[PDB]
Write a protein that binds this ligand. Sequence first.
Ligand SMILES: O=C(NCc1c(F)cc(F)cc1F)c1cn2c(c(O)c1=O)C(=O)N1[C@H]3CC[C@H](C3)O[C@@H]1C2
Ligand SMILES: O=C(NCc1c(F)cc(F)cc1F)c1cn2c(c(O)c1=O)C(=O)N1[C@H]3CC[C@H](C3)O[C@@H]1C2
Ligand SMILES: [Cl-]
Ligand SMILES: [Cl-]
Ligand SMILES: [Mg+2]
Ligand SMILES: [Mg+2]
Ligand SMILES: [Mg+2]
Ligand SMILES: [Mg+2]
Ligand SMILES: [Zn+2]
Ligand SMILES: [Zn+2]
Ligand SMILES: [Zn+2]
Ligand SMILES: [Zn+2]
Lengths: 69, 270, 252, 31, 270, 47, 32
Amino acid sequence: IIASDLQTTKLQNQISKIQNFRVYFREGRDQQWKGPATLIWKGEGAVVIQDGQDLKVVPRRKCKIIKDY
Amino acid sequence: GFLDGIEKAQEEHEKYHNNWRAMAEDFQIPQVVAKEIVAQCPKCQVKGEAMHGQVDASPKTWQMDCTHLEGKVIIVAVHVASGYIEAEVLPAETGKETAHFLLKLAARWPVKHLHTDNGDNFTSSAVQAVCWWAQIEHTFGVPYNPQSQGVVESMNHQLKTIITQIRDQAEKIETAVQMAVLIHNFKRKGGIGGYSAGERIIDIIASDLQTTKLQNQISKIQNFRVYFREGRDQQWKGPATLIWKGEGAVVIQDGQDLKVVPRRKCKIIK
Amino acid sequence: FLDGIEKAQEEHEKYHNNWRAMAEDFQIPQVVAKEIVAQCPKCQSPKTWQMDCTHLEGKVIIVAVHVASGYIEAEVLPAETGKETAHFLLKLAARWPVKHLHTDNGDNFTSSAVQAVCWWAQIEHTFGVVESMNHQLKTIITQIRDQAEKIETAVQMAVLIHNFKRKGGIGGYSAGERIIDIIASDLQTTKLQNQISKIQNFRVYFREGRDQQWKGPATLIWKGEGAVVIQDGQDLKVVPRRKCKIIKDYGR
Amino acid sequence: IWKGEGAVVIQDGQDLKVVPRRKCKIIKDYG
Amino acid sequence: GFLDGIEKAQEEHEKYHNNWRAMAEDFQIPQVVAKEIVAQCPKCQVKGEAMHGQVDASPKTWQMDCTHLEGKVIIVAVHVASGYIEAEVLPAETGKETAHFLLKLAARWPVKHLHTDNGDNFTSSAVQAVCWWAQIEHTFGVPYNPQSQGVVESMNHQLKTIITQIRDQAEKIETAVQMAVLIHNFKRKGGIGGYSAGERIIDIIASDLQTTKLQNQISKIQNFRVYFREGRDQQWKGPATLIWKGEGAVVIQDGQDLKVVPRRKCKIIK
Amino acid sequence: GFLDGIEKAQEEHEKYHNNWRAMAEDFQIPQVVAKEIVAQCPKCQVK
Amino acid sequence: IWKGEGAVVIQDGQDLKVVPRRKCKIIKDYGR
DNA sequence: GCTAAGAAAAATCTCTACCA
DNA sequence: AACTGGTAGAGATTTTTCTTAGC
DNA sequence: GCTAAGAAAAATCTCTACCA
DNA sequence: AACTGGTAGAGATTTTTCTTAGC
Ligand SMILES: O=C(NCc1c(F)cc(F)cc1F)c1cn2c(c(O)c1=O)C(=O)N1[C@H]3CC[C@H](C3)O[C@@H]1C2
Ligand SMILES: O=C(NCc1c(F)cc(F)cc1F)c1cn2c(c(O)c1=O)C(=O)N1[C@H]3CC[C@H](C3)O[C@@H]1C2
Ligand SMILES: [Cl-]
Ligand SMILES: [Cl-]
Ligand SMILES: [Mg+2]
Ligand SMILES: [Mg+2]
Ligand SMILES: [Mg+2]
Ligand SMILES: [Mg+2]
Ligand SMILES: [Zn+2]
Ligand SMILES: [Zn+2]
Ligand SMILES: [Zn+2]
Ligand SMILES: [Zn+2]
């Protein structure tokens, strides 16, 4: 009972430290910097982010991705 | 110690928005802590990561755009792998004329992939119907990012410089556009092979067809299955087709995927 | 090497092979094989187009055909004057290499506008395949007529079906594959001819075995890392580089 | 060496490598 | 031969405007002749030589410009060697207010050289009168070339980003401009010495004064005249002052010009 | 961010006097700040 | 006090003295 | 007769503006 | 979760080619 | 007691947008 | 004949510093 709780907390710790990133992006006709969003997919050249239950594709030249220590 | 310095640095950044070198020198905290104080601020974070991507350059990809010259509308298509240009003057910038231009282009050359921006004539039901009938995959760029279509905007620049060079030899603008297309395609050399654009599109399409037929004839008479050992765990994967054996490594095909495996981790079976 | 050159000369003396086949079979370079063909007395078009006008549903269809492959470019004209014919010819010459044009003695084909376009684009025009291609295109146009609304759409859809969907002939190819193969073969021949003239502007003095006197001026054919192929006395022979001296020749 | 559907095997200076198809140009290069 | 090829290449370029690689391959002429055929054409020659210059960065040079923000007029001056900024909001873009701004700047700091563009407020009789009274040399840039004043346009960019960072802490725009000047001058570090802009202007001006006084005291007690031999002809030039003698070369002053002469070509005389 | 982890690690060491690798692994803070939290305590010693 | 390429200046017993680097071991101190 | 200096000519590398 | 800057010319630097003086 | 592997932390290098 | 692009931040790669296992 206790051992399964320890193993579950270890696996959830690894899963929580894999892909919890924040994205600040720049989009629109007047290109303003907008708030945080969640990274979904990251390819070379562009990223797919989820912001306010809307999917957007941003080039990596117009975004900043913040990790966790 | 520096824990009270960390609290003072948070108050100071909340007022003045220092960068990390100013806080790490004024309050004598380490640089990881000052970098975290700046990185947890939303009023900062206004800068991108300073790189460029690379566009798709397959042997059947075309890019398309519209430009303006003397109150007319020119539409330009470019073959990406060679630099080969087709261009025309439209009476209007509607979707019907863009669909007719795309249908003539597909009737002349093999088109399998089209890349455009998000203009109103390209996001149209007529263009969608022509792409459905002629079996073309249409992709659009990220909005307000002209670097996604870099080749056709570079060719907009080249076409306009040639038109100002030969402008006084024609009466109308449409004659001058077709003369500039001829000068670009056949009278300018230099590039990958020292070619012009017409010689390069002939070489690219002919080499594509010849190399598919050659490796069809090669693969239909093969033998020598290969069993190989790879992965993070030293497992054994299934039947792989040997393609080429070199002095140092071998080339195998597994699940229509090509892999280069060294000679120690594989065995050939007749 | 020299065994391959002698075998290629004997085989050409029997059967008169071509230079691509001899270069692939006997494993010699292509400039040597081209010289073997060029020395034979018994061994000595990719850019010609035909144009015509036809009628359909009160509209004028103008058709150009590439003769060596059967490749088609068509259009629908607003009238049958010489200005629209000159504009169609200028577009065709802008997209494909056109050097020889064959037409009939029509009015719009014999005009000052067509004459000025042929002068600017350097085309040889001759007045007298297109009729067979017009009949085949019109059978396709009546076959796919109900899939389109206008006549220009049906014309371009029939051009696509003719060029890329109908296969036949010897190997079973369409017309687009045949025109690209023909033009690529001509491009290979012209590039090799440029290399041949640039190499053959030299001259070779060679020193034969067990002689200390230099021989006559032999023309250079091929220059390798360790071998040199020369022509002398209507004979080809291979001399190594340690007994050769290559000098420029000014014999225009 | 081999041209696949989404990858190309090339030999560059006695080094075999696998490049994507969209990053290659295959010529015969008369010259 | 290729002499008839040269005549054909001239006719062909007159019609089509080929580049030199196309003519050198089609007509088989050498590349020097084809380069000359292109270089003698006026319809070509539309391209610059692809380099950048470097601006004057003496320790008493200032650059100045005007920018716009929310319907106001900001005027910015920058000290070039340190990056030190003064900025204000003007009621209008006339020459009277620009002359008053320049007079306050000259009353605060030592100004000897001013560089501006060709705006109407800078090419003015009031600015000319202030520069005459305060003994400032005014230079103007090449017209419609903003790269001549590169430092002050870079600082226009930095000032606007800081103003958007601290905008919600002030009511008016003038308070926000002065808060941004304080944040730039004293709260941002990194550069030549790891300094801010205020520490760097203090270091530059203080080191200038100290090094002049030190070498005045050094040069007033010198001796050791030097006779040296240089030039394309092995001549002898006149009395030169020895400044420093190093292991390998010596430093001499001749006609207020500094020269580094090796030790073989000189003799020291007491 | 780990600055809230710094405040929580200070409270946790004031109660239980943890070692520095334990605080660095549990609160996800760097090792320099964890050694400093141990170093400012008069009863403890980083070893 | 000072760490040189070959010398080290230390304070001990209200006295300053110079010890060479071959007879010294420098360790971090956590004595806040 | 053979080598090598010296200059001409060709090839390769870095960097810029413009494309709504 | 499946996207992306590129082209061509102007000089600068390095390498290859060609003629002739000298032993 | 001394060395060295391994990881954390700091320093240096390349490249981008924006400034009418 | 006397003029001229620059600044600062985001990652990537390399170097220095610090703790601990092992002989
Ligand atoms: O800024 C443009 N070019 C200049 C440029 C470049 F080419 C390449 C670069 F790397 C940088 C550049 F600055 C440019 C802008 N737009 C369009 C263009 O085609 C276009 O070339 C376009 O069609 N649209 C439609 C889709 C939505 C609406 C109409 O706005 C956009 C705006
Ligand atoms: O294009 C400008 N900046 C952007 C920019 C840059 F900063 C630096 C770059 F390397 C490139 C850039 F594109 C710009 C233009 N002008 C003036 C500016 O100050 C100015 O910054 C200005 O004052 N004048 C006056 C003098 C005559 C009239 C009024 O037109 C000019 C126009
Ligand atoms: Cl767009
Ligand atoms: Cl100006
Ligand atoms: Mg567009
Ligand atoms: Mg565009
Ligand atoms: Mg200005
Ligand atoms: Mg300005
Ligand atoms: Zn901040
Ligand atoms: Zn024959
Ligand atoms: Zn020209
Ligand atoms: Zn404690």
